[PDB]
Structure 1
Amino acid sequence: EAEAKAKALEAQYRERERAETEALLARYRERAEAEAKAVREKAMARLDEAVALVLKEVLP
């Protein structure tokens, strides 16, 4: 009984480890892509509105 329950615990919860790790990690890749494209969208429209300010400051 000790060996049977030990092997059952080890195998089943090892595959539980792998499944839960993968299931959480995939949505972490999802958040990575989401954050990257969201800051791209925030970046791509607000260009050239401040480069006239930095050219006002650089040129004497």
Structure 2
Amino acid sequence: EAEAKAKALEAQYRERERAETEALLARYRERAEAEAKAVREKAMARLDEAVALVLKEVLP
């Protein structure tokens, strides 16, 4: 029964581990998509300026 009880632990140990680690991914990924967007968004506004600047070096 010291083996048995521990067997009963194991289930949960794999399950809870699975469920959470798998869940952690959801949280990260779906936040990754978002955070990726937010550096795009910072640029969007002040973006034009970049083109303008870059264009200016190349032009003469």
Answer yes or no: same fold by TM over 0.5: yes
Matched, 1:11 2:11: yes
Q: Percent identical across equivalent pairs? A: 100
Q: TM-score, normalised by structure 2?
A: 0.76
Q: TM-score, normalised by structure 1?
A: 0.76
Spell out structure 1 runs of 4+ moving beyond 3 A: none
1:2 CA drift (Å) = 2.4
In structure 2, runs of 5+ residues without a counterpart are: none
Distance 2:37 2:56 in 1: 31
Greater helix proportion: 2
In structure 1, runs of 5+ residues without a counterpart are: none
* Root mean square deviation, CA, Å: 1.6
